């Protein structure tokens, strides 16, 4: 069975359930936007993201001598219904490609179960949802109803290639780092991809290569989904914790520091830059956070609202955090179970492992240099499929990653900008 049971068309009439006009909790004003619920707890908004951050509502590019090297602007991208239809279909197709692998099925299952914790109440004797982990859906009668959700895929903001995982913060709680979790908004586009070089010495050099091979967009989305997994379970590493790259002369002369959260997400050898001691520090830190959630759950006596029963919610979080329950019914965190879950989310779900499952060529490290951005169209089956990506079986593109070779499969890629030599 498919991850997305319905093949939505952007123009399909709204129904107030899985096709509806919605508003997000940006703590500001906005006109409702058309959205599609593609799976339990997951929505797609085919719009440029001018909502999550009020200071980023301008899609227009600054003057030429003001733009960052690695960036791409086009204020008109994703403004027409045809584009939105293709965006919806492209994102859906990538979710299917990801779900078709055992690793992808595992990651998506973890994401759906990762409901943001109900820790919004001010009194420890009752559990209450945090409204910023919900969206407001316009019902058939014109009224709004609050719906909890775990993930939203939305178009990029001004800089089209700056894909990232975003979420609304709390006045006092660090939701992505206190075990609670929060609704994740992933800025992403299936309509562009990036080039990389097949030789490591070239890919990690800022002056060489034009970007001969194209990254499979399913890997790019998986990368953001991995971050979402960490953030939904509240175990993301503080961005202030970074690796002062000293293994790349070019990075060094720029004094560039890369966050541990990114190295962990890529996995492979990159993850090894995080030493054992710091690794243990974080593990214990989050163990203590899961413990506090257990203590808060015990002090809870009632539930706020009538959408679900306390028994239901207390159990939903017992399954999310895989807690244990004694005779009296008190909750506790088990070391073996915590370590297993923590390891699954941080070591099993990595970019490097997804590359193995998709059988594609990909950058070998996160510590490299971008080469170029290409326009693509993965919707037509003659171009890309759920099962083979660009490397179509029984064609000349089947072997040696020929489908990702932009020189061989040139009809599937239009280079929009070169980054090499501009750093």
């Amino acid at each position: 069975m498919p991850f997305v049971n319905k093949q939505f068309n952007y123009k399909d009439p709204v129904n107030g359930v899985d096709i509806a006009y919605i508003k997000i909790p940006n703590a500001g004003q906005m006109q409702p936007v058309k959205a599609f619920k593609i799976h339990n707890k997951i929505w797609v908004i085919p719009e440029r993201d001018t909502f999550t951050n009020p200071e980023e509502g301008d899609l227009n590019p600054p003057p030429e001598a003001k733009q960052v090297p690695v960036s791409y602007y086009d204020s008109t991208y994703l403004s027409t219904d045809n584009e939105k239809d293709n965006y919806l279909k492209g994102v859906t197709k990538l979710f299917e490609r990801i779900y078709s692998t055992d690793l992808g099925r595992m990651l998506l299952t973890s994401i759906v179960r990762g409901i943001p914790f109900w820790g919004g109440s001010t009194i420890d004797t009752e559990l209450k949802v945090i409204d910023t982990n919900c969206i407001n859906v316009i019902q058939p009668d014109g009224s709004y109803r609050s719906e909890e959700l775990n993930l939203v895929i939305i178009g990029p903001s001004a800089d089209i290639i700056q894909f990232e995982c975003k979420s609304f913060g709390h006045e006092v709680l660090n939701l992505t780092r206190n075990g609670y979790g929060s609704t994740q908004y992933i800025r992403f586009s299936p309509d562009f991809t990036f080039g990389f070089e097949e030789s490591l010495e070239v890919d990690t050099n800022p002056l060489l290569g034009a970007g001969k091979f194209a990254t499979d967009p399913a890997v790019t989305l998986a990368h953001e989904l991995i971050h979402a997994g960490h953030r939904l379970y509240g175990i993301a590493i503080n961005p202030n914790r970074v690796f002062k790259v000293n293994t790349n002369a070019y990075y060094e002369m720029s004094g560039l520091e890369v966050s541990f959260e990114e190295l962990r997400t890529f996995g492979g050898h990159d993850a090894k830059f995080i030493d054992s001691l710091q690794e243990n520090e974080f593990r214990l830190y989050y163990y203590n956070k899961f413990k506090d959630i257990a203590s808060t759950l015990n002090k809870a006596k009632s539930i706020v609202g009538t959408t679900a029963s306390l028994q239901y919610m207390k159990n939903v979080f017992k399954e999310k955090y895989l807690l244990s329950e004694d005779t009296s019914g008190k909750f506790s965190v088990d070391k073996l179970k915590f370590d297993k879950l923590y390891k699954m989310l941080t070591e099993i779900y990595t970019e490097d492992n997804f590359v193995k499952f998709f059988k594609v060529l990909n950058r070998k490290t996160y510590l490299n240099f971008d080469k170029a951005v290409f326009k693509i169209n993965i919707v037509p089956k003659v171009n890309y499929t759920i099962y083979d990506g660009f490397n179509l079986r029984n064609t000349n593109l089947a072997a040696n990653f020929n489908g990702q070779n932009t020189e061989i499969n040139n009809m599937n890629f239009t280079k929009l900008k070169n980054f090499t030599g501009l750093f």
């Binding site: 960052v68 090297p69 690695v70 290639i161 700056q162 894909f163 990232e164 995982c165 990036f194 800022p206 790019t220 990368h223 953001e224 971050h227 990075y251 720029s254 560039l256 890369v258 990114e262 996160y366 510590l367 490299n368 240099f369 971008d370 750093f423």
Partner: peptide, 6 residues
């Protein structure tokens, strides 16, 4: 995040 500033 897709990549560093590089």
């Amino acid at each position: 995040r897709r990549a560093t500033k590089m």
